[PDB]
Amino acid sequence: RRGYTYPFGDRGKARDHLAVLDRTEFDTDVRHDAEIVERALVSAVILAKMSVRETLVTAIGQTEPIAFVHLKDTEVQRIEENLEGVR
Amino acid sequence: MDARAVAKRPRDPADEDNELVTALKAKREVNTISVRYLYHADHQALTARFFVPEGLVEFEAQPGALLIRMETGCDSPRHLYISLYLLGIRASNVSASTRCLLESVYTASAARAALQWLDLGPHLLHRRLETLGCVKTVSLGITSLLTCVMRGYLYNTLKTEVFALMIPKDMYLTWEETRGRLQYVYLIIVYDYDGPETRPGIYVLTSSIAHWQTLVDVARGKFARERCSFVNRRITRPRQIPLCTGVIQKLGWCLADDIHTSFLVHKELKLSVVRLDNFSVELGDFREFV
Amino acid sequence: HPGFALTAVRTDTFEVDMLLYSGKSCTSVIINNPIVTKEERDISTTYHV
Amino acid sequence: VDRWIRHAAGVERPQLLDTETISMLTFGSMSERNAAATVHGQKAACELI
Amino acid sequence: LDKILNVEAMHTVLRALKNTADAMERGLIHSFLQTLLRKAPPYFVVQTL
Amino acid sequence: GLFSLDRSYEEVKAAVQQLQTITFRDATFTIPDPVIDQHLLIDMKTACLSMSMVANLASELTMTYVRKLALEDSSMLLVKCQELLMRLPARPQHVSPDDEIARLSALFVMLRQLDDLIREQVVFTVCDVSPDNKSATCIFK
Amino acid sequence: AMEANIFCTFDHKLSIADVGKLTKLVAAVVPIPQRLHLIKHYQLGLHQFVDHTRGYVRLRGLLRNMTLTLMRRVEGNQILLHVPTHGLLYTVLNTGPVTWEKGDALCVLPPLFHGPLARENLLTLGQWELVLPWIVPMPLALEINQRLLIMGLFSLDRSYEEVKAAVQQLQTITFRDATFTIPDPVIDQHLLIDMKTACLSMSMVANLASELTMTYVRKLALEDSSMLLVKCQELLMRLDRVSPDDEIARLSALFVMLRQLDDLIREQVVFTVCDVSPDNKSATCIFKG
Numbered sequence A: 001r002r003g004y005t006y007p008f009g010d011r012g013k014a015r016d017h018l019a020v021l022d023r024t025e026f027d028t029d030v031r032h033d034a035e036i037v038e039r040a041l042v043s044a045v046i047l048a049k050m051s052v053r054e055t056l057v058t059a060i061g062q063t064e065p066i067a068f069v070h071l072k073d074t075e076v077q078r079i080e081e082n083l084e085g086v087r
Numbered sequence B: 001m002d003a004r005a006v007a008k009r010p011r012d013p014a015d016e017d018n019e020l021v022t023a024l025k026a027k028r029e030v031n032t033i034s035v036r037y038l039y040h041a042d043h044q045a046l047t048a049r050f051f052v053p054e055g056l057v058e059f060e061a062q063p064g065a066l067l068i069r070m071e072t073g074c075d076s077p078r079h080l081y082i083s084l085y086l087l088g089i090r091a092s093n094v095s096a097s098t099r100c101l102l103e104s105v106y107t108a109s110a111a112r113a114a115l116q117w118l119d120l121g122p123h124l125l126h127r128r129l130e131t132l133g134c135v136k137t138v139s140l141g142i143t144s145l146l147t148c149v150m151r152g153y154l155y156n157t158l159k160t161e162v163f164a165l166m167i168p169k170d171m172y173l174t175w176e177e178t179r180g181r182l183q184y185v186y187l188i189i190v191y192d193y194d195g196p197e198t199r200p201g202i203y204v205l206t207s208s209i210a211h212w213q214t215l216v217d218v219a220r221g222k223f224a225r226e227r228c229s230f231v232n233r234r235i236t237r238p239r240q241i242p243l244c245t246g247v248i249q250k251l252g253w254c255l256a257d258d259i260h261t262s263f264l265v266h267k268e269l270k271l272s273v274v275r276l277d278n279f280s281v282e283l284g285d286f287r288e289f290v
Numbered sequence C: 001h002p003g004f005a006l007t008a009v010r011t012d013t014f015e016v017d018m019l020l021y022s023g024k025s026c027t028s029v030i031i032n033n034p035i036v037t038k039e040e041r042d043i044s045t046t047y048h049v
Numbered sequence D: 001v002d003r004w005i006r007h008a009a010g011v012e013r014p015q016l017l018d019t020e021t022i023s024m025l026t027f028g029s030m031s032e033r034n035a036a037a038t039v040h041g042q043k044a045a046c047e048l049i
Numbered sequence E: 001l002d003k004i005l006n007v008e009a010m011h012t013v014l015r016a017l018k019n020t021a022d023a024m025e026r027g028l029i030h031s032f033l034q035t036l037l038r039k040a041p042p043y044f045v046v047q048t049l
Numbered sequence F: 001g002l003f004s005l006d007r008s009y010e011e012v013k014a015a016v017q018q019l020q021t022i023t024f025r026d027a028t029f030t031i032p033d034p035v036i037d038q039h040l041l042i043d044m045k046t047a048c049l050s051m052s053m054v055a056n057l058a059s060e061l062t063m064t065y066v067r068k069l070a071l072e073d074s075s076m077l078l079v080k081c082q083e084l085l086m087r088l089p090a091r092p093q094h095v096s097p098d099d100e101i102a103r104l105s106a107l108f109v110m111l112r113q114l115d116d117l118i119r120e121q122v123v124f125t126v127c128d129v130s131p132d133n134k135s136a137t138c139i140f141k
Numbered sequence G: 001a002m003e004a005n006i007f008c009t010f011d012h013k014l015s016i017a018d019v020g021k022l023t024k025l026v027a028a029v030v031p032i033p034q035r036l037h038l039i040k041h042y043q044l045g046l047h048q049f050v051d052h053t054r055g056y057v058r059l060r061g062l063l064r065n066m067t068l069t070l071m072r073r074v075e076g077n078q079i080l081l082h083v084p085t086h087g088l089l090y091t092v093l094n095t096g097p098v099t100w101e102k103g104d105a106l107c108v109l110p111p112l113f114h115g116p117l118a119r120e121n122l123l124t125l126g127q128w129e130l131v132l133p134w135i136v137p138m139p140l141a142l143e144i145n146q147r148l149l150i151m152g153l154f155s156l157d158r159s160y161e162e163v164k165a166a167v168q169q170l171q172t173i174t175f176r177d178a179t180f181t182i183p184d185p186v187i188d189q190h191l192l193i194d195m196k197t198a199c200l201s202m203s204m205v206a207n208l209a210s211e212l213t214m215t216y217v218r219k220l221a222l223e224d225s226s227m228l229l230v231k232c233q234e235l236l237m238r239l240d241r242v243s244p245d246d247e248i249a250r251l252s253a254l255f256v257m258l259r260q261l262d263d264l265i266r267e268q269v270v271f272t273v274c275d276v277s278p279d280n281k282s283a284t285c286i287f288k289g
Helices: A011-023 A033-051 A073-086 B019-027 B084-090 B096-105 B109-120 B212-222 B224-236 D002-009 D019-027 E002-038 E043-048 F009-019 F038-057 F060-070 F076-082 F097-118 G016-022 G056-063 G138-153 G161-171 G193-211 G213-223 G227-239 G244-259
Strands: B046-052 B066-069 B081-083 B130-137 B144-153 B165-168 B183-190 B201-207 B246-254 B260-265 B270-276 B280-282 B287-289 C037-039 C046-048 F125-129 F136-139 G006-008 G029-032 G067-074 G079-082 G089-093 G105-109 G134-137 G271-276 G282-287
Touching (some): A011 A033, B046 B130, B046 G271, B096 B270, B212 B224, B212 B287, F009 G244, F038 F097, F038 G193, F038 G227, F060 G193, F076 G193, F097 G244, G105 G138, G193 G244, G213 G227
Antiparallel strands (some): B066 B130, B130 B144, B165 B270, B183 B201, C037 C046, G271 G282
């Protein structure tokens, strides 16, 4: 709903990426969660990089990796130490 | 320049011959085309001609009916020339018996397409529709070529007999018990801002009021329920944008004595109408009121 | 080869010259004089005969 | 399976015709463009099982 | 120069009159051919009749 | 009319000495007998309804443009329009083109429904006056 | 049998190429500041009103009261102009960037494309450059007015990338086979004066109408003969879920900022298409003034 009203650099591929993101609400069993959360996350960070108009890897077969955008170093370090604490 | 030529009387146009008559008379030939009396020369009614498919020209073969172009975001057939009765199909103002009557005559592939294009988009009707005036002659071909007028009276060629304006009874609306010597006829599309339906009300106003403020005061006084529904939809539903609860424009002015009840017949179907015989069109843009 | 068979129906348009025979004064046409009407614009006035 | 079928048959997707364009198309539309070049003529065939 | 322009305009409207007269005659011939072809059945139906 | 409500009679008598003096085009004019009327009640009711509607449909950027200009720019007209307002770099919370053009169209409709009260009608459009200012020519009748 | 026309002359010399350029604009609209009879060429169009500091809004305000005319014929002697009148049809060129259709309400606009251009190279003399106003259909004119006003309203926050994205969204305008764009009104990171006062009056009347409403409906509520009034005040009370001379001055300020916005909140139709010629260079339209 935030990316619905956002004015992008183009309406087309942002419309495609929100169309990927919005249909995958959640999944039922234990297997289907990982690939749908990965697809939702890569569509989300592509929309995030398009909203700030930053560059992204768009070569075929190279998926944009998961990364936090435009934050302080202590916040992303808090993300990594929380990743370590839950691992 | 001379006082003889300045105080000379103005020339009668019907007494002087045509340009073609003097052009043929100068070189002194003869053509099989009779040319000495040009037709439509004394025609103050500026007209226009419109192609339209067959699916919309029923209840139009009799002369005298409105004609409205629409806009549609699809590219090629983008503007349909819809009659007033097919517009009244969509309207919530009309009685359901007459609605099922005139829907039963308009069973066509173009009419239902226009009905879908009416209620498909997010725009209201007044931002979508655009009048053309009233129609005087038909072509009744495989596609129809109607002749509408922008300004002036409605008459047959050679002005042998005047053409009347027809309106169905449900769209007819007066707001006074007696009429003046002159009265203008308008168009009213009032919006019911209700939850289930947003279908408007279509009206014509045979009123003797010319001033816009003294018209819109009686317009608010007769349509207070609709503005109350507007502000109720405003307070109940936030972050919605309602606008132009009613719209108003000038269509023409009549004689205020030839207004009488007649009926239209199309495929042995009676449709009772208010009929205005000596009527001249006078178009104007969609003003609005809230 | 699948189970069902196919039947193709193609149409074909040829240009062709028809000839026509008629009787001596088979029908009767009646005409009148041509009439000019004047449709007026600013830069160009048209006339429908 | 629809994407696989559109790839296997060569025909593209509709690519989301608008509903007003849908009512246009059921009113009538010339979707298919002309080819690059035709030497024989305009194409014509159909199919029946 | 006024005489030149007046003569050219008079010859223009005379040429238009001659052209539409010949066009009216050609349209009479064409419409008569059309209303003949409307009521001309082909060879096989009248031959079998 | 808007000042006639909930005011003392001497407050209206102190207002009419301010509001009756019109000095348009170097010629003074006076307003005769400003009283209450039911038609004036109708104009006041539609004025308050239109004012409420344009107050509701005003977005935050229209509401904050005066402060956003008064924080940096400086002019005499900005000062003269600021003193009639009240007292009380940040990013906008939420903007959208398609919502706000609809907001501006409905807001133009409400300002038209406010404008029609004071604008009566055009009935003469002058082309050339007589040089003694006693006659003119006009169109649009 | 002559007709009432306007005899315009040219004090510069005219080439045969410039005469052939001028005869392309037969059915072209030309604004004129005052309908005289023997006018020079210096008051044809809008080159009298081209200014570096002024902007689109003052051009629209002048064009609301200009005397629009049509050309008739061009000669080495002089130039013929025709004043139109209401209720008559005329041929008019489509010098605007958008094609028309039949029955479309048309109105006259100041040119968005400004200064030297490949399309503005018309009848350009030494100190003179003949410019012509656009003849646009009415809803596109309303869209241009709204989009230009809201692009003027985002003038003070161009540092944010999101506002630049919204501006780039607004700066492109589609229409039926028409994807032209407009120039942004902000130059040198500042706004031109007429657009600035227009949007300032807009913000001022919005602020004053949000301010003074509750006291007025509270005063009106004690004579409640209309049930619309209580839902009118309930709207403002759900939205939130003074000296008398200050009141008088704020009322007069609100009405004068509304009066300065009169030309922008409404416009009149000038022509409507009776019919359109093929190739869409021109169309036969009835004048409406």
